[PDB]
Design a binder for this molecule. Structure first.
Ligand SMILES: *[C@@H]1O[C@H](CO)[C@@H](O[C@@H]2O[C@H](CO)[C@@H](O[C@@H]3O[C@H](CO)[C@@H](O)[C@H](O)[C@@H]3O)[C@H](O)[C@H]2NC(C)=O)[C@H](O)[C@H]1NC(C)=O
Ligand SMILES: *[C@@H]1O[C@H](CO)[C@@H](O)[C@H](O)[C@H]1NC(C)=O
Ligand SMILES: *[C@@H]1O[C@H](CO)[C@@H](O)[C@H](O)[C@H]1NC(C)=O
Ligand SMILES: *[C@@H]1O[C@H](CO)[C@@H](O)[C@H](O)[C@H]1NC(C)=O
Ligand SMILES: [Ca+2]
Ligand SMILES: [Ca+2]
Ligand SMILES: [Cu+2]
Ligand SMILES: [Zn+2]
Lengths: 478, 1200
């Protein structure tokens, strides 16, 4: 009755050894490298010795497919996920990969989206720890705190201040401006670039800050800090549901307590628990206003954002949009509405799906205010929904590792062979920039370059006055 | 259409020509006060229920008796709420009201006649069935609760119902007593009004009723019966039989309808039928001559000593018989050359339709005799009746026999009908004296007679006593031992292999086999090693009722010395056997002239007939399939063949294939492997213990089904060392022979249909080869009742497993019966009908199984649930001849609660765990730092303990991830159980000893593995064979309940019409319209839930299905609208049948409060432990969060 149709080899248990591997130990592309745990020998049909079994068919070992999310790939094929790319080789993924990263976002007036995708609402008026590495055993490298003033129920005139301490340097982001109160010890990797509507601050190899100059604060950290950071942005462990862990290593069920646990200054009063008001003042007892808010926020799931609905979760962004628009008197001039839509579009474009949603009817933007072609500025200011944020300029001649692929706003296109200058806001010759060059790296005037930071015998600090380069030996503290 | 019948079980006093009987009576109104008139010819029969193929029958049964009754119908289809029979079908108490109707109560049964229940193209205008009370089959049948059910073709709506019933007053409901053999409840020709038309043909819907195996032969004098366009001399009524007969009345006057069995002459199954207006000539000279006949010439002699050796009180072989002899001339001087084969038979008479037989008979014997044919009607003198006219010795008479049209075979019958002629002066005495001759009635020749000559009834007994015995004075005629030696069981007058027919190899032979004599039981005639073409189909065993003949066609392709006999043990051992001498005169898909090798052994095992489900254990011998020729590892029998029980392995083959069976006798006494299909080219088919034998042959067209019948045919194989004791010891098995390209090359079976082989027999442990050992082990006129088991495949009392089939698929049933004459089994599938194929297609619902015959039927189950296949013989069913089979639906495949939390944490266990990765976390989509079961050990297992047995259609497995590693189970096997003690590994469609499932390749992908055929279990168990790092599992069981009621009723799929949902009030404004018709589950949009205008605890949402449905669970869900999470947290449920009479769903005596949602997005399902049979459903919310909003989904099924 054990009729194995050829070329399938029949295996029958000796019934005496009681140790031979039978049919249970079927080899498969899934489990070729895995040890068999057999209770006892099973008799049955098997693929010939040179082949393994794949679903309902026998395939050669050289043609075993590699596996990925709900899919199979033939050997030699390539795939790309996140920051990494891999090739199918011996049922494995041989990867030529970079270092991935994740972004924690301050969405809306008082909404926080952690690195693990957890979104919560916390209308705290205190100054809180946005993200810090001081979590038990800590190296103590960076600490970013956020302070909100006016983000209560009358959140129309709210303001946010970002205080960043890194390598002994203090940076304050406020009123759409960046002030370096104390210079960092190593300024080689410290860069601040202004591209379009956004400002990108690189504060090291794995620390990036993105600001929309009004309300959107994004902290980009590489995966090396998967188990080193803590705060309002979570512990970066990859688990969404445990981001509500307080500073005392206790998970808080109420987000208000989790937010209050990371208070910096005890002078300010703690945020008390308030029942969730679904309809604020403008939307309270106003069906028409709520309908208008819902219709305005429905654009996040429209045809223009159709390609993004399969990549980025639209529920938290839609909730933030509704909550912010229900506090605005009018939708046309609602700054929070446009800022939330711009942040969502930026997130969508970070995955490769750029959406051109802006129009004169809804959140109009134009570059004609700065396109002073007749005023001696030889630059072409054009609006772009996603343009590179690390374009070479006089202030940034050396290419930089941009944390984001592209950003939205006005960019100054130049004639070929020219370089933009932000101080003069115009395109000039590449040699006209006040840029020095050392060790193959070009840096604008006023910048400090550190060579051999860990070698006292070769440590050098180089400065550029205008075009002359002056390098001095580093002073030994002792 | 719809037909209303008002039935009442009225308890009356009945006289057959005064006992107390309960009878179904038809009334006129629903008040059951006025009884509808019934014609006098019906008697004890209830009213005739006639239904067309597209009708529905509604019967209101009121129990006016002192005992419970019911209405169990045969032939029609119905739901479990109208079956009328009580057994372990796992239905609700609302579906149990049909089972018993206690006195004073009432019930309503609805029977649907479908296209499946209609007569086929070949079946007559109306199929015949019966309804009957089924509370206690023996008492209900013997009390008179039986009625006719005529299923006619559409447009069908003269004909008579005939109930040939043996009412045993000792087993009725009023017994707390003779057996009355009656026609429609009347005995001794007292049945009136049975009129018929002069020339018009009359249809008889014959129902034979009886609680004990008791066959009947029904003759109408001067008439024949057309059954399935086959001409027959009589009706062969089995104890429970449905058939349709057609009789062409031609002669005016009164004729007798009677049972011809001699032992039933005093019983009185007689009635009168009043018919009223509404060229070749053979010449034969035959003489009756007295002569000495040697019943066993050239035989050297125990049975042989008792029957053949002469002694002081033993006559011996020779007896003075009287015999018919053929003479060449009128002067009666020279006899024609006699043949050794014909034996005691007279000259063979032949006649075609319209031919005339000119018979000239001279009574040359010393006693008056006569000659008269059976089957031939027009018998006249050449120049009361000639039947009783005696011919004085020395006289000469001339008869003229005219073979008319109503005597010859039809185009469906064989070319020649086998009849006889004999003396009708004293039928039994003249027949026992030796006057019998063969007759052939053919349409425009090896005769074999199985005859029991009772010499004690012969007219020449005194002369034999005075001649062959030394002391005639010292002869005790009443001595049973002396009388036994005179009852000669012979073939053509030859006893103990004194007859040897020799036929040529590769020739065609017509055998006319006849069964006349003192025997009152049917005979199971067989030719060892030969299949023969009877009624246009190749069969193996011929069932011969007394006084009947059958024509058989066969080709003598099997050479050797074979034994022709009958499967009656006493007759076989009393010398009713004859000898028959035959001699010459690259990647590929695993699934997408050959020899089919098998390895069967005879093994000794303990068997308790399924009574463990002190219990006696009997040591039996069975056929056992092994993997290979070493016979050291038996082949595992899985889900598909678990129904076999005691039956042996399926030996499947096609035409032109080679069967090679290696048979090893591992038992304690010699056995054999015998099948009638084993061909050779005598032989000692005798396998000693610890010896092997190979049976190799080629399957030919005579071993296969014809082009008309089903794709496979079933044959029986068994041990032939002792045909009776070896069957009682448990040696029997199915051999399937199928058409070409009908078996799957990879699996070896026909996967288009699903096949089940049922073997019904009464095992008698007193007749087994191990009776002494069984008595010694167990026992440390009711003694034999404790050792007889009316089993199906060796199982009694609904304990046979494995009969699980899918709805709307085609099922092929191979039905076998083996044993003595008591094994006439009236096999019935409750609520289901099937088709049989001889040369046409016939629709049936009952089948009478005769020992040695392996029938094949095919059905299509339409209703889901647990049904019963039983034997309608009251005593066999009461002794436990029944079993349960489940018809599941593939549609009902719903989560079993692993992810929904319905399976609590105490129902999940495991061999162990690693850290805090508890087995209770092994749930699909479970999220967390520790979100799965996981163990750091090899050879683990995770067990889910479902609270009740249920159907498992598949399992959805999922791994998990740790800090940087993915953990999953790549390969696993599945075990399951119903009590937690015996674990049976899953096999399904596998080619090996278990089904191997493949698991996950990552930590998030859901791997869905199917169970087909499904699992029917209470416990399930997963054993990981391969795992990545640790055996981590997040699983989800997909399944259903036994009655297949767990699927949604059409809210999430929007199958419910928008006009079918309403409410007391709904909240609407200029923008949002929370209409009730938008409360469907998982509905996405604006105002996607029902919300009343005013929030109050007296609101309700009403769903109307416009038809009776069964609700078994309600799934509720909330909404999140305008950042407000509104959802009902507690609610109650009410039901109504018309919309204005509502009742709250109370549980345990008080109203049940259903726990709603904890969050608006996760649905929660509350299952009603008692099913709710309703048309109108209402949900009343009690506690609501932030508003009264509810999205609902009803779980259930359809009903009547
Ligand atoms: C195990 O074997 C059974 C039967 O051999 C398999 O079930 C059968 O699967 C076939 C699909 O190849 C089904 O046929 C389909 O039927 C539908 C409905 O009539 C028809 O529309 C399709 O065109 C197709 O013919 C068949 O119904 C089904 N029968 C049963 C009883 O399930 C099963 O899939 C096998 N499972 C495994 C895991 O091997
Ligand atoms: C992966 O590919 C590179 C380049 O083809 C090769 O050098 C290397 O051996 C491969 N395997 C691994 C494990 O890197
Ligand atoms: C019927 O006839 C039989 C014999 O002919 C007789 O013994 C019996 O008493 C009669 N009546 C009944 C009711 O059986
Ligand atoms: C048959 O063989 C078994 C072991 O294989 C042995 O125990 C038994 O005695 C043998 N029976 C015989 C030789 O009759
Ligand atoms: Ca986390
Ligand atoms: Ca029932
Ligand atoms: Cu029976
Ligand atoms: Zn009878």
């Amino acid at each position: 009755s054990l009729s194995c149709r050829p070329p399938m080899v029949k295996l029958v248990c000796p019934a005496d050894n009681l140790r031979a591997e039978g049919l249970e130990c079927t080899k498969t592309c899934q489990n070729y490298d895995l040890e068999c745990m057999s209770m006892g020998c099973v008799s049955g049909c098997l693929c010939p010795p040179g082949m393994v079994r794949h679903e309902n068919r026998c395939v050669a070992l050289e043609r075993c497919p590699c596996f990925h999310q709900g899919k199979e790939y033939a050997p030699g094929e390539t795939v790309k996920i996140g920051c990494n790319t891999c090739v199918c080789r011996d049922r494995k993924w041989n990867c030529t990969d970079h270092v991935c990263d994740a972004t924690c976002s301050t969405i809306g007036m008082a909404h926080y989206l952690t690195f693990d995708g957890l979104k919560y609402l916390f209308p705290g008026e205190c100054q809180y720890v946005l993200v810090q590495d001081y979590c038990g055993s800590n190296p103590g490298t960076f600490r970013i705190l956020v302070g909100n003033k006016g983000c209560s129920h009358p959140s129309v005139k709210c303001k946010k201040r970002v205080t960043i301490l890194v390598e002994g340097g203090e940076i304050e982001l406020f009123d759409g401006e960046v002030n370096v109160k104390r210079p960092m010890k190593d300024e080689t990797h410290f860069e601040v670039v202004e591209s379009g509507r956004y400002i990108i601050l690189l504060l090291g190899k794995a620390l990036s800050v993105v600001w929309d100059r009004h309300l959107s604060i994004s902290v980009v950290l590489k995966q090396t800090y998967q188990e080193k950071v803590c705060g309002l942005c979570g512990n970066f462990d990859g688990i969404q549901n445990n981001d509500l862990t307080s500073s005392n290593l206790q998970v808080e069920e109420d987000p208000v307590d989790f937010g209050n646990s990371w208070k910096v200054s005890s002078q300010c009063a703690d945020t008390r628990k308030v029942p969730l008001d679904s309809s604020p003042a403008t939307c309270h007892n106003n069906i028409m206003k709520q309908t208008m808010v819902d219709s305005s926020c429905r654009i996040l799931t429209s045809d223009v954002f159709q390609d993004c609905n399969k990549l980025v979760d639209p529920e938290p962004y839609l909730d933030v949009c509704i909550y912010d628009t229900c506090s605005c008197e009018s939708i046309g001039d609602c700054a929070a509405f446009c800022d939330t839509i711009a942040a969502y579009a930026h997130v969508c474009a970070q995955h490769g799906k750029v959406v051109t949603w802006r129009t004169a009817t809804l959140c109009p933007q134009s570059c004609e205010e700065r396109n002073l072609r007749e005023n001696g500025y030889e630059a072409e200011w054009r609006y772009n929904s996603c343009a590179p944020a690390c374009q070479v300029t006089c202030q940034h001649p050396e290419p930089l590792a941009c944390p984001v692929q592209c950003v939205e706003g006005c960019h100054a296109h130049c004639p070929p062979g020219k370089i933009l200058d932000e101080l003069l806001q115009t395109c000039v010759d590449p040699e006209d920039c006040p840029v020095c060059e050392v060790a193959g790296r070009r840096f604008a005037s006023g910048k400090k370059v550190t060579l051999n930071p860990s070698d006292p015998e070769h440590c050098q600090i180089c400065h550029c006055d205008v075009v002359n380069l002056t390098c001095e030996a580093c002073q030994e503290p002792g | 259409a719809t037909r209303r019948y008002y039935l009442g079980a009225v308890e009356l006093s009945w006289d057959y020509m005064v006992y107390k009987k309960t009878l179904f009576v038809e009334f006129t109104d629903h008040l059951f006060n006025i009884a509808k008139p019934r014609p006098p010819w019906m008697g004890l029969l209830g009213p005739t229920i006639q239904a067309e193929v597209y009708d529905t029958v509604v019967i209101t049964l009121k129990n006016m008796a002192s005992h419970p009754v019911s209405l169990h119908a045969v032939g029609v289809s119905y739901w479990k709420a109208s079956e009328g029979a009580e057994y372990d079908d796992q239905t609700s108490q609302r579906e149990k009201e049909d089972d018993k109707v206690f006195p004073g109560g009432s019930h309503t049964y609805v029977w649907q006649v479908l296209k499946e229940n209609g007569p086929m193209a070949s079946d007559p205008l109306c199929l015949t069935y019966s309804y009957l009370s089924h509370v206690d089959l023996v008492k209900d049948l013997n009390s008179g609760l039986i009625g006719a059910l005529l299923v006619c073709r559409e447009g069908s709506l003269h004909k008579f119902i005939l109930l040939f019933a043996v009412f045993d007053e000792g087993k009725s409901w009023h017994s707390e007593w003779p057996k009355m053999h009656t026609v429609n409840g009347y005995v001794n020709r007292s049945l009136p009004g049975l009129i018929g038309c002069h020339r018009k043909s009359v249809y008889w819907h014959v129902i034979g009723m009886g609680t004990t195996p008791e066959v009947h032969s029904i003759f109408l004098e001067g008439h024949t019966f057309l059954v399935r366009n086959h001409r027959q001399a009589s009706l062969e009524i089995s104890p429970i039989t449905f058939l349709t007969a057609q009789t062409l009345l031609m002669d005016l006057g009164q004729f007798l309808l009677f049972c011809h069995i001699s032992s039933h002459q005093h019983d009185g199954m007689e009635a009168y039928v009043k018919v009223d207006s509404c060229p070749k000539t053979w010449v034969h000279y035959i003489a009756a001559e007295e002569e000495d006949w040697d019943y066993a010439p050239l035989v050297l002699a125990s049975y042989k000593s008792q029957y053949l050796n002469n002694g002081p009180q033993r006559i011996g072989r020779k007896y003075k018989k009287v015999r018919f002899m053929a003479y060449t001339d009128e002067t009666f001087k020279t006899r024609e050359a006699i043949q050794h084969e014909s034996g005691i038979l007279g000259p063979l008479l032949y006649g075609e339709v319209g031919d005339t037989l000119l018979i000239i008979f001279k009574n040359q014997a010393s006693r008056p005799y006569n000659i008269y044919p059976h089957g031939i009607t027009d018998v006249r003198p050449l120049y009361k009746h000639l039947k009783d006219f005696p011919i004085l010795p020395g006289e000469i008479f001339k008869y003229k026999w005219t073979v008319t049209v109503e005597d010859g075979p039809t185009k469906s019958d064989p070319r020649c009908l086998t009849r006889y002629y004999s003396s009708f002066v004293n039928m039994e005495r003249d027949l026992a004296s030796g006057l019998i001759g063969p007759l052939l009635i053919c349409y425009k020749r090896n005769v074999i007679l199985f005859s029991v000559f009772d010499e004690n009834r012969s007219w020449y007994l005194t002369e034999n006593i005075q001649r062959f015995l030394p002391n005639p004075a010292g002869v005790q005629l009443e001595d049973p031992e002396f009388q036994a030696s005179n009852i000669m069981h012979s073939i053509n007058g030859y006893v103990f292999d004194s007859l040897q027919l020799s036929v040529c190899l590769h020739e065609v032979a017509y055998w006319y086999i006849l069964s006349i004599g003192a025997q009152t039981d049917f005979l199971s005639v067989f030719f060892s090693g030969y299949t023969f073409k009877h009624k246009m189909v190749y069969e193996d065993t011929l069932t011969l009722f007394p006084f009947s003949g059958e024509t058989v066609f066969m080709s003598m392709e099997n050479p050797g010395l074979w034994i022709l006999g009958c499967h009656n043990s006493d007759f076989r051992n009393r010398g009713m056997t004859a000898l028959l001498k035959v001699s010459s005169c690259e990647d590929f898909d695993i699934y997408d002239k050959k020899t089919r090798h098998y390895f069967i052994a005879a093994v000794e095992r303990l068997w308790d007939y399924g009574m463990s489900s002190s219990v006696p254990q009997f040591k039996k011998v069975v056929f056992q399939e092994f993997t290979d020729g070493s016979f050291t590892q038996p082949l595992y029998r899985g889900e598909l063949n678990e129904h076999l029980g005691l039956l042996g392995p399926y030996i499947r083959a096609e035409v032109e294939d080679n069967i090679m069976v290696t048979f090893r006798n591992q038992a304690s006494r010699p056995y054999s492997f015998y099948s009638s299909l084993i061909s050779y080219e005598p032989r000692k088919n005798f396998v000693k213990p610890n010896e092997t034998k190979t049976y190799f042959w080629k399957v030919q067209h005579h071993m296969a089904p014809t082009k008309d019948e089903f794709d496979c045919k079933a044959w029986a194989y068994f041990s032939d060392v002792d045909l009776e004791k070896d069957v009682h010891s448990g040696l029997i098995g199915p051999l399937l022979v199928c058409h070409t390209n009908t078996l799957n090359p990879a699996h070896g079976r026909q996967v288009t249909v699903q096949e089940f082989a049922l073997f019904f027999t009464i095992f008698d442990e007193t007749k087994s080869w191990y009776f002494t050992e069984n008595m010694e082990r167990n026992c440390r006129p009711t003694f034999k009742e404790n050792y007889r088991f009316h089993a199906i495949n060796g199982y009694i009392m609904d304990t046979l497993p494995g009969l699980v089939m899918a709805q709307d698929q085609r099922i092929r049933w191979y039905l076998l019966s083996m044993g003595s004459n008591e094994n006439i089994h009236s096999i019935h599938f409750s609520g289901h009908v099937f088709t049989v194929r001889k040369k046409e297609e016939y629709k049936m619902a009952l089948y009478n199984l005769y020992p040695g015959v392996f029938e094949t039927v095919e059905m299509l189950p339409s209703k889901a649930g647990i049904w019963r296949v039983e034997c309608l013989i009251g005593e066999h069913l009461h002794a436990g001849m029944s079993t349960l089979f489940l018809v599941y639906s593939n549609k009902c495949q719903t989560p079993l609660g692993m992810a929904s939390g319905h399976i609590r944490d105490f129902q999940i266990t495991a061999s162990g765990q690693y850290g805090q990765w508890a087995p209770k976390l092994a749930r699909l989509h479970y999220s967390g730092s520790i979100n799965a079961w996981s163990t750091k050990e090899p050879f683990s297992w995770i067990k889910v303990d479902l609270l009740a047995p249920m159907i498992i259609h598949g399992i959805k497995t999922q791994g998990a991830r740790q800090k940087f590693s993915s953990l999953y189970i790549s390969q696993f096997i599945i075990m399951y159980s119903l009590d937690g003690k015996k674990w049976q590994t899953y096999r399904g469609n596998s080619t090996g000893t278990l089904m191997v499932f493949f698991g996950n390749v990552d930590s998030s992908g859901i791997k869905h593995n199917i169970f087909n055929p499904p699992i029917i279990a209470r416990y399930i168990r997963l054993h990981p064979t391969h795992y990545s790092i640790r055996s981590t599992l997040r699983m989800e069981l997909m399944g259903c309940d036994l009655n297949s009621c767990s699927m949604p009723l059409g809210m999430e799929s929007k199958a419910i019409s928008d006009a079918q949902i309403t409410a007391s009030s709904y909240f609407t404004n200029m923008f949002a319209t929370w209409s009730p018709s938008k409360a469907r589950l998982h509905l996405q949009g604006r105002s996607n839930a029902w919300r009343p205008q005013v929030n109050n605890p007296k609101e309700w949402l009403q769903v109307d299905f416009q038809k009776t449905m069964k609700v078994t669970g309600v799934t509720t869900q909330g909404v999140k609208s305008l950042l407000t999470s509104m959802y009902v947290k507690e609610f109650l449920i009410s039901s109504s049948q018309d919309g204005h009479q509502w009742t709250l769903f109370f549980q345990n005596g008080k109203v049940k409060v259903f726990q709603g949602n904890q969050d608006s997005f996760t649905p929660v399902v509350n299952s009603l432990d008692p099913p709710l049979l309703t048309r109108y459903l209402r949900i009343h919310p009690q506690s609501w969060v932030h508003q009264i909003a509810l999205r609902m989904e009803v779980l259930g099924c359809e009903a009547q």
